[PDB]
């Protein structure tokens, strides 16, 4: 065994099976702990008459002879921590009238003999936790008059009998956490004076114990995880000088108006979940409180004298309760955090936050704050975090917020004006309701929750100059050629064949699409380089709605008219139905109209992009409307394709051949130009494929009106029917 010069022999871990021999005659300490000692024979310590610290923890000690510890009249500490020791040795420890600390915790103690703890009077610390004790020892504890600390913590205790700790007069700390304590008689703590700490942390207490009223001086009370639900008034009348009350994580409903009253030394007061309490707590006399947290309950008012008292208050978290009016927070110079979430506060007055130096974090989210005074935050100097999300705002002040490092405004959809970045020079996290408001701050790097991206541009709506000119050319050619075809077809004012009427109707739909893209290009021209302010107004206004309706209606009408043209061509190949086809064309027009109008019925279809195109959609929505339209158009193309291949199958007349060829070319072009847009609309539904939003927007803008700008060119240049109609129009005008 390793020795030491200070008479502190350390034999821990040596693997000994008995008390070491050959040691010095007189020692003061002994550390035989990890050496496996099964039992202590009689007078195993007779060689050591001056030992004062014996540490027999660790080893699996099962038997101690009654005379083993005899002759140790100078022992001070005896630690039998991790042994077997099924019972407390009442005879072995008897006669040790000098020790002050006794550790018997990690043993599998199940019974305590009534004669235990006899003959020793200087004991001050006692460990009996982590055992299996069904009842609190009464007589053995009564044998100890000088005990200053006791831990009956992790036993199987069920109830505390009255007058259980009567003779423990000079007891300061009592731990009873983590057992099955269920009932405490009203006299269980009688005679237990100057007890500063009581720890009933994790027991099963349903009713609040009144026995604590028998403790005159008590600092820490720790009923933490119990079934306590109601705290009566005057629950702490007998403890005027308590500082810590732990009651977190137990089901509370009612707390009482004056439960925490006249507790001058109390520092914190955290209540959560007590939803049945109406009035604000009566905290008069409790002025040293430094942080009060209140539940989600039915508290509607705050006492105006909240800051007149509680001069040392550092944080208040009223939160989930329903507060309506905020008193003037003048004073409370030490207040740093104010949390008012999910309240019902209708406005912020100018004097509500007057003063409040050293106020760092302010949370006001989930309230009904429709008005904020211009100089509400002017006095706040060191304010850093501001959370006013989902507050139904309409205007936001700027003065006094220069020092903000985090601003939240997510849910204020009615707040639309841009926020200047000159006022907020220290932002590092920003959350604005609309993506157009954030790009004014660009990205010191500012992180904005709504990503600007490419589908919410604030510099140029169309993008590059090549795209701008392509869109301009498409609009011009579509409008002019569609108008020319419409005039040269409908100016005959004579018998109109079904094919010519259908060509005119498709030209009308393409003219409408040209009008849509002209609206888009005029918006881009008049908002060149400054789309940041225009985007919110455009998306929220009726201009985006009408543009989207025009686009959807024109596309759907063109598709349906092309289908009916295919059906008419098939019937003409088979073989007089002028009125029937006119009625069918009107039916197609009304179907296109209702399809275009459905987004107006639905919520926010056209607000996704400034292009006001619903079926080009993001990853998250994957809307039923767009998927149904894509599927309808796809199955429509399949139907017309298969019927026209059937027409070829039954067909291996020159005018008929020209008409069917022109219709086939229209079909082929329309299918080609609708395929990429449908592919990009279906792309978000699958996560495997990722396509850049800039390319998506460019392809959509270039291909969506392309059939509209292309069909009139085909009809004008490759159909002799147009030449005949032009000759007829020239004859009519001349």
């Amino acid at each position, epitope marked *: 065994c390793s020795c030491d010069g200070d008479r502190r022999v350390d034999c821990s871990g040596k693997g000994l099976t008995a008390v070491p021999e050959g040691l010095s005659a007189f020692t003061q300490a002994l550390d035989i702990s990890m050496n496996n000692i099964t039992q202590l024979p009689e007078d195993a310590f007779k060689n050591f008459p001056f030992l004062e610290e014996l540490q027999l923890a660790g080893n699996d000690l099962s*038997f101690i002879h009654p005379k083993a510890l005899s002759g140790l009249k100078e022992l001070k500490v005896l630690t039998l921590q991790n042994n077997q020791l099924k019972t407390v040795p009442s005879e072995a420890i008897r006669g040790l009238s000098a020790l002050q600390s006794l550790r018997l915790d990690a043993n599998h103690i199940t019974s305590v*003999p009534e004669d235990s703890f006899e003959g020793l009077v200087q004991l001050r610390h006692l460990w009996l936790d982590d055992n299996s004790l069904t009842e609190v020892p009464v007589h053995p504890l009564s044998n100890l008059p000088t005990l200053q600390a006791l831990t009956l913590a992790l036993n199987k205790i069920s109830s505390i009998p009255d007058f259980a700790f009567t003779n423990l007069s000079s007891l300061v700390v009592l731990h009873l956490h983590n057992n099955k304590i269920r009932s405490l008689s009203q006299h269980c703590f009688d005679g237990l004076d100057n007890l500063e700490t009581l720890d009933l942390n994790y027991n099963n207490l349903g009713e609040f114990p009144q026995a604590i009223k028998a403790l005159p001086s008590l600092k820490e009370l720790g009923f933490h995880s119990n079934s306590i639900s109601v705290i009566p008034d005057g629950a702490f009348d007998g403890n005027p000088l308590l500082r810590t009350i732990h009651l977190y994580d137990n089901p509370l409903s009612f707390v009482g108006n004056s439960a925490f009253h006249n507790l001058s030394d109390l520092h914190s007061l955290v209540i959560r979940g007590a939803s049945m309490v109406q009035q604000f707590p009566n905290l008069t006399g409790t002025v040293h409180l430094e942080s009060l947290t209140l539940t989600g309950t039915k508290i509607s008012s705050i006492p105006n004298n909240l800051c007149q008292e509680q001069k040392m208050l550092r944080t208040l978290d009223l939160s989930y309760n329903n507060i309506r009016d905020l008193p003037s927070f003048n004073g409370c110079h030490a207040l740093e955090e104010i949390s008012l979430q999910r309240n019902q506060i209708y406005q912020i007055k100018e004097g509500t936050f007057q003063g409040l130096i050293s106020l760092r974090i302010l949370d006001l989210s989930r309230n009904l704050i429709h008005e904020i005074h211009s100089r509400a935050f002017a006095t706040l100097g060191p304010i850093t975090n501001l959370d006013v999300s989902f507050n139904e705002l309409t205007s936001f002040p700027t003065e006094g917020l220069n020092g903000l490092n985090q601003l939240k405004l997510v849910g204020n959809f009615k707040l639309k004006e841009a926020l200047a970045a000159k006022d907020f020079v220290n932002l590092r996290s920003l959350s604005v309701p609309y993506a157009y408001q954030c790009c004014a701050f660009w990205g010191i790097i500012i992180h904005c929750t709504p990503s600007t991206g490419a589908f919410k541009p604030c510099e140029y709506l169309l993008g590059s100059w090549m795209i701008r000119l392509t869109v301009w050319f498409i609009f011009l050619v579509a409008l002019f050629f569609n108008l020319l075809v419409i005039l040269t077809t409908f100016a005959s004012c004579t018998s109109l064949p079904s094919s010519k009427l259908f060509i005119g109707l498709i030209s009308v739909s393409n003219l409408f699409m040209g009008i849509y893209t002209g609206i888009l290009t005029f918006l881009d021209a008049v908002s060149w380089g400054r789309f940041a302010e225009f985007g919110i107004w455009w998306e929220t206004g009726s201009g985006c709605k009408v543009a989207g309706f025009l686009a959807v209606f024109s596309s759907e009408s063109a598709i349906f008219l092309l289908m009916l043209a295919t059906v008419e061509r098939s019937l003409s190949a088979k073989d007089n139905h002028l009125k029937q086809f006119r009625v069918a064309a009107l039916l197609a027009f009304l179907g296109a109209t209702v399809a275009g109008c459905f987004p107006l019925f639905h919520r926010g279809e056209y607000s996704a992009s400034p292009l006001c195109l619903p079926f080009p959609t993001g990853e998250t929505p994957s809307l039923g409307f767009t998927v149904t339209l894509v599927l309808l158009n796809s199955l429509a193309f399949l139907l017309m394709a298969v019927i026209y291949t059937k027409l070829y199958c039954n067909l291996e007349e020159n005018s008929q051949s020209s008409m069917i060829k022109h219709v086939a070319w229209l079909i082929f072009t329309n299918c080609i130009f609708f395929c990429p847009v449908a592919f990009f609309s279906f792309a978000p539904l699958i996560t495997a494929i990722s396509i850049s939003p800039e390319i998506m927007k460019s392809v959509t803008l270039i291909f969506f009106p392309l059939p509209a700008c292309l069909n009139p060119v085909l009809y004008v240049f490759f159909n002799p029917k147009f030449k005949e109609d032009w000759k007829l129009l020239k004859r009519r005008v001349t």
Partner: nanobody, 108 residues
Framework: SLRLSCAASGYTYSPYCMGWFRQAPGKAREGVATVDLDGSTIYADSVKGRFTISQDNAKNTLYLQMNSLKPEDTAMYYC???????????????????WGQGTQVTVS
């Protein structure tokens, strides 16, 4: 059958709650039997069997006779007493104040 007798002449009068214990090799010792001053006897429920304790004041000898012994029963047997008053009778080693040497037993 094997009978063993604990002779104790140290006490002036017969102490109460005097009993026997069996110690497994390198394990704790459990009370096979004990007898009070009045004569009430306490055994272990699983160990209860053919054997019984008998004590006589005139004899001053505790007789423990075992019949139909079992191979799983063999261990070292002790003999403990308790003179001082103020504790309930039981089968735990803590309450007892004096002990003997012990004896091994054999099985057939």
């Amino acid at each position: 059958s094997l009978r063993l007798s604990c002779a104790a002449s140290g006490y002036t009068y017969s102490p109460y709650c005097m009993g026997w214990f069996r110690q497994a090799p390198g394990k704790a010792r459990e009370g096979v039997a004990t007898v009070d001053l009045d004569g009430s006897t306490i055994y272990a429920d699983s160990v209860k069997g053919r054997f019984t304790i008998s004590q006589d004041n005139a004899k001053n000898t505790l007789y423990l006779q075992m019949n139909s012994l079992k191979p799983e029963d063999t261990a070292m047997y002790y003999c403990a007493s308790r003179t001082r008053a103020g504790v309930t009778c039981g089968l735990n080693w803590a309450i007892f104040s004096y002990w003997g040497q012990g004896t091994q037993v054999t099985v057939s």
